[PDB]
Design a protein around this ligand. Structure first.
Ligand SMILES: Nc1nc2c(ncn2[C@@H]2O[C@H](COP(=O)(O)OP(=O)(O)OP(=O)(O)O)[C@@H](O)[C@H]2O)c(=O)[nH]1
Ligand SMILES: Nc1nc2c(ncn2[C@@H]2O[C@H](COP(=O)(O)OP(=O)(O)O)[C@@H](O)[C@H]2O)c(=O)[nH]1
Ligand SMILES: [Mg+2]
Lengths: 159, 64, 437, 431
């Protein structure tokens, strides 16, 4: 979406809440992709910008939009430890079991990052615990290899 | 005292009222043996890390 | 007989040497190629300038000097410069790597590699002497070569040349021109090691010279070239009596006899006058009274200190040019009336006076004006202890934290050497205090 | 002292290294073919510090280009000055480090290291008098970080008496999104504390902030960041490559700058700050250069110098200016701000003036500070490291390379001791 698309991506990365609103009204494309296929929603999800996530979604952003590595905004918020964003995306129809080019599910990424509360919310929302990445690893395997005792207990109940 | 290109005298205002070479070699020897012992201790500590990196590589094969 | 070998160590020593030898040549009428029309070829090898210059079969006059540096750039300038024909290549000695402003590096690491070669070149100069008086050693306190290599050399010279006189021209550090934070460490380490090996040392405080250049010569930002030209004038005043048929300070031993009453308190204060700008309007020449008065003014000193806060133990007045004894005696009499020239209990209150008829000489397009009469006072005052106290305080500040000590220890030096050197300085300050209490 | 051997490791190291070579070649009047086309004997006086003179009046950088990835080497060769480098000096692997310090330090790096040392030995043995080494690398990646520190240790083993100098780029979440940067940087800092003599802390946090806040660049690129790095690298090396009195070689610089062995992390500063192709209106004055030079906004490390005390400072002024004015301005700053300079290191600020200004400017100033405020950089990295480490995040990528958790604990402990040591000297009194 030209000038507006690059400006919208800049404002979601910077967390310029009021500048995102100004650009939507001007007609900036909500799903305007960047160099890596990241929409303003992936950028807000990486950087932890909760309100921007909510304004983008209310203005019809694509909750399941996949970048070039195949990561949706749910994979990014799960990796970066943004619990409140993982809860907002889930409530707005995010794919709990979405798979990137490496076979990573959001649970794969939350387990590796050691985000205990994110793993609990992902499992609550139906994350498959038996999913295997292209390395042949489940999220339980990830926690055991990391040495994460608390997380392996949290995942063993289903796996 | 009157010399060819000069002259000299005193003005009294008032009277008074009233081979070590071997040790040098021993000191330079000590400093040299100390500098080598400093370098040799840096080398043993780096040779120690080299053993750890060969240990790390053998541990990698224990996984896959 | 009665030859003096000059040794220039490190940048400061080499650069001051350049300025001194340029001035000596102007004074004796020696051209930069070593030729002089005034002399006769041996002959011809018995006039006073022969104490400092040897003569070759081609009628050329060669400085009895050795230039040493652990790095080649400064000496490379001597071997490419205006006086490249004055010196023979063997008397210009350089290494590849300098002492990196580290006394320990200059003394213990790098110095050890070139010491035998330097002594071999000194020995070749001494072989050409029939009555070697001794050595004049020029160096900085601050640099690693000037500090570290000098003390190593001084020790070896005491071994190889037994009871032979050694005088120093030492560059005392000033922050305006300093290149190393560690200069106080190097200064104290070199002073401790050289103390028992030096007979008489003339310190040159770079700040005193810097201030004289600014105030008397109207130089906004003095360079080493400005500093060295001024330094050379004072060195020339001190050595005039060795290089001309004197009457006072006729030999190196006489400096000791006249200025040093105790071997450790061997640091005389030099005061020179007049220092007048060359770019100045025609003015009436200063009288003998005016130049003598200027000798008792702290602003004209080669070291910043207050003689009013000390006591004299020896005083030498070295006049040059159009000077008459009647005017000197009258000037001395009037000075005692206006000035507190307090001597210690055990010394007589007086002066040893020397007039050297040779006119004061300046470098042609230099900063100094040519004068009819000049004077250099050499005095041994307890006030010079103030220069040691300033240095000792800076040493103490850093040493309490062992700041930079690892650089010396890494070169093989022991921490105990820093303590030993500092205790020797504390004993030196105590000696100055005790002398004239 | 004479020759410096330069090593470029990883993507960042090669990008920043290539920029350094193009900037210094222009200053020394060397074109992309290796021919000298300058107009001043000052440009060639100390040319030998960075260049070897080859047959036929050509000058060749004494540079070794290293990567575990081939792509960067191609980018260098294809660059403006790409043809100036010795072809045999390009040492590259085929499989990168995958942003993993362990792969760079123990696995892939170790497999390439001997090929690199053979090239560094050839360059070093050809030196009349080797000063030491200068390495450009990032701490956030895998090659520059892991392999770069491996190289430092291997070089320290063979040349224990030479100076080891680095231009180490610190990671920031503002410029990179790789989650493992805190692990890679902490593991590298542990190595640098023990194995380098002097490190220029080039912080991407500060470079981004300067571009965004001062230069008003909405979206800073690595090209914008690298314009600040190259200006800094040119400034801090001025004294090594032009005739002068102060910090003329790597050892004299270290002796003046490093009071305690571990405290060798420098905070670089630069004035005036400019954007690639900004049309800089009027040269700055000496009081303007001095004021800006000590300004937090002009620091290449994201630390406020007013939050600490300067142990030692090196200030380099470039261009035609009054040495009297520089001396007055420098004395004024020290007198006015006495409390930000340790009292127990007298005359700890050294100033140099070089007549040759850099490209595009008539007047410039470069600051090199050894400040206790650099602890803020280490605390930022330590907090990011701890947040991840305490949750056992991404550890399997490192242990999978044969590393143990203990190495992480040790690296973290060493960095916290460094912070504690800076604090100790910050609070020390001349009493
Ligand atoms: N008056 C004067 N002082 C100088 C000169 N050159 C250096 N200095 C001073 O001497 C000290 C530095 O010592 P240097 O003589 O340069 O060093 P060095 O003896 O060559 O030793 P290294 O370089 O460390 O191996 C500082 O106090 C300088 O200001 C000079 O030509 N004249
Ligand atoms: N300033 C700067 N930082 C860079 C550049 N390229 C990469 N980086 C940073 O370097 C780190 C990534 O390491 P990199 O050198 O690319 O990986 P390596 O090839 O494995 O050594 C991150 O902190 C990046 O932000 C560059 O050109 N300039
Ligand atoms: Mg030198």
């Amino acid at each position: 979406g030209s000038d507006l698309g690059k400006k919208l991506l800049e404002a979601a990365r910077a967390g310029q809440d009021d500048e995102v609103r100004i650009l939507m009204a001007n007609g900036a494309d909500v799903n305007a992709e960047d160099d890596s296929g990241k929409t303003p929603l992936h950028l807000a999800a990486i950087k932890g910008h909760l309100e921007i996530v909510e304004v983008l979604l209310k203005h019809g952003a694509d909750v399941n939009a996949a970048d070039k590595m195949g990561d949706t905004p749910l994979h990014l918020a799960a990796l970066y430890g943004h619990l409140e964003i993982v809860e907002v995306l889930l409530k707005n129809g995010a794919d709990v079991n979405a798979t990137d080019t490496y076979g990573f599910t959001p649970l794969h990424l939350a387990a590796d990052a050691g985000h205990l509360e994110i793993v609990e919310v992902l499992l609550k929302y139906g994350a498959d615990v038996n999913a295997q990445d292209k390395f042949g690893k489940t999220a339980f395997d990830i926690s055991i290899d990391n040495g994460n005792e608390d997380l392996a207990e949290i995942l063993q109940k289903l796996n | 005292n009157k010399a060819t290109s000069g002259q000299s005298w005193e003005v009294i205002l008032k009277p008074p009222s009233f081979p070590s070479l071997e040790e040098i070699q021993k000191k330079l020897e000590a400093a040299e043996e100390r500098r080598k012992a400093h370098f040799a201790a840096m080398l043993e500590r780096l040779q120690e890390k080299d053993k750890h990196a060969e240990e790390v590589r053998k541990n990698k094969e224990l996984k896959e | 007989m009665r030859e003096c070998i000059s040794i220039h160590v490190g940048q400061a020593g080499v650069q001051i040497g350049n300025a001194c030898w340029e001035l000596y040549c102007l004074e004796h009428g020696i051209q930069p190629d070593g030729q002089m029309p005034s002399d006769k070829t041996i002959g011809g090898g018995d006039d006073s300038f022969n104490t400092f210059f040897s003569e070759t079969g081609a009628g050329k006059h060669v400085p009895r000097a050795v230039f040493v540096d652990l790095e080649p750039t400064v000496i490379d300038e001597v071997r490419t410069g205006t006086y490249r024909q004055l010196f023979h290549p063997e008397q210009l000695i350089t290494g590849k790597e300098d002492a990196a402003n580290n006394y320990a590096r200059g003394h213990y690491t790098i110095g050890k590699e070139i010491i035998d070669l330097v002594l071999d070149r000194i020995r070749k100069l001494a072989d050409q002497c029939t009555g070697l008086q001794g050595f004049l050693v020029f160096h900085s306190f601050g640099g690693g070569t000037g500090s570290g290599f000098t003390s190593l050399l001084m020790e070896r010279l005491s071994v190889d040349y037994g009871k032979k006189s050694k005088l120093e021209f030492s560059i005392y550090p000033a922050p305006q021109v300093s290149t190393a934070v560690v200069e106080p460490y190097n200064s104290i380490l070199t002073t401790h090691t050289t103390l028992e090996h030096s007979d008489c040392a003339f310190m040159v405080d770079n700040e005193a010279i810097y201030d004289i250049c600014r105030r008397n010569l109207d130089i906004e930002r003095p360079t080493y070239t400005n500093l060295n030209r001024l330094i050379s004038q004072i060195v020339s005043s001190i050595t005039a009596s060795l290089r001309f048929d004197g009457a006072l300070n006729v030999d190196l031993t006489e400096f000791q006899t006249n200025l040093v009453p105790y071997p450790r308190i061997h640091f005389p204060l030099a005061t020179y006058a007049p220092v007048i700008s060359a770019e100045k309007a025609y003015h009436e020449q200063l009288s003998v009274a005016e130049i003598t008065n200027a000798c008792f003014e702290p602003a004209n000193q080669m070291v910043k200190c207050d003689p009013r806060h000390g006591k004299y133990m020896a005083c030498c007045l070295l006049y040059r040019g159009d000077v008459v004894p009647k005017d000197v005696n009258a000037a001395i009499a009037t000075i005692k009336t206006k000035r507190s020239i307090q001597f210690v209990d055990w010394c007589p209150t007086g002066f040893k006076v020397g007039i050297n008829y040779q006119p004061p000489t300046v470098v042609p397009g230099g900063d100094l004006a040519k004068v009819q009469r000049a004077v250099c006072m050499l005095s041994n005052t307890t006030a010079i202890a103030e220069a040691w106290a300033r240095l000792d305080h800076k040493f103490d500040l850093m040493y309490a934290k062992r700041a930079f000590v690892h650089w010396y220890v890494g070169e093989g030096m022991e921490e105990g050497e820093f303590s030993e050197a500092r205790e020797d300085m504390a004993a030196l300050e105590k000696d100055y205090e005790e002398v004239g209490v | 002292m004479r020759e410096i051997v330069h090593i470029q490791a990883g993507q960042c190291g090669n990008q920043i290294g290539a920029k350094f070579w193009e900037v210094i070649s222009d200053e020394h009047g060397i074109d992309p073919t290796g021919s000298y086309h300058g107009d001043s004997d000052l440009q060639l006086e100390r040319i030998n510090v960075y260049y070897n003179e080859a047959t036929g009046n050509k000058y060749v950088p004494r540079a070794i280009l290293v990567d575990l990835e081939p792509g960067t080497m191609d980018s260098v060769r294809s660059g403006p000055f790409g043809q100036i480098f010795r072809p045999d000096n390009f040492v590259f692997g085929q499989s990168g480090a995958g942003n993993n310090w362990a792969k760079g330090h123990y696995t892939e790096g170790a497999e390439l290291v001997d090929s690199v040392l053979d090239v560094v030995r050839k360059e070093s043995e050809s030196c009349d008098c080797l000063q030491g080494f200068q390495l450009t690398h990032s701490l956030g990646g895998g090659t520059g970080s892991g392999m770069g520190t491996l190289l430092i240790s291997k070089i320290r083993e063979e040349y224990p008496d030479r100076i080891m100098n680095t231009f180490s780029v610190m990671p920031s979440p503002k410029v990179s999104d790789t989650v493992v940067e805190p692990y890679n940087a902490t593991l590298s800092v542990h190595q640098l504390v023990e194995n380098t003599d002097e490190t220029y802390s080039i912080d991407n946090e500060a470079l981004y902030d300067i571009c965004f806040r001062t230069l008003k660049l909405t979206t800073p690129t690595y090209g914008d960041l690298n314009h600040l790095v190259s200006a800094t690298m040119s400034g801090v090396t001025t004294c090594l490559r032009f005739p002068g009195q102060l910090n003329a070689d790597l050892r004299k610089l270290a002796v003046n700058m490093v009071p305690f062995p571990r405290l060798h992390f420098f905070m670089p500063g630069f004035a005036p700050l400019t954007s690639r192709g900004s049309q800089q209106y009027r040269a700055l004055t000496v009081p303007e250069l001095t004021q800006q030079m000590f300004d937090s906004k002009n620091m290449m490390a994201a630390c406020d110098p007013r939050h600490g005390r300067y142990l030692t400072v090196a200030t380099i002024f470039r261009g035609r200016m009054s040495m009297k004015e520089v001396d007055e301005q420098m004395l004024n700053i020290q007198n006015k701000n006495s409390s930000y300079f340790v009292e127990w290191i007298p005359n700890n600020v050294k100033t140099a003036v070089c007549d040759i200004p850099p490209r595009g400017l008539k007047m410039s100033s470069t600051f090199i500070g050894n400040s206790t405020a650099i602890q803020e950089l280490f605390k930022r990295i330590s907090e990011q490291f701890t947040a991840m480490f305490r949750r056992k995040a991404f550890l399997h990528w490192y242990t999978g390379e044969g590393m143990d958790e203990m190495e992480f604990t040790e690296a973290e402990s060493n960095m916290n001791d460094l912070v504690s040591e800076y604090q100790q000297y910050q609070d020390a009194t001349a009493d």
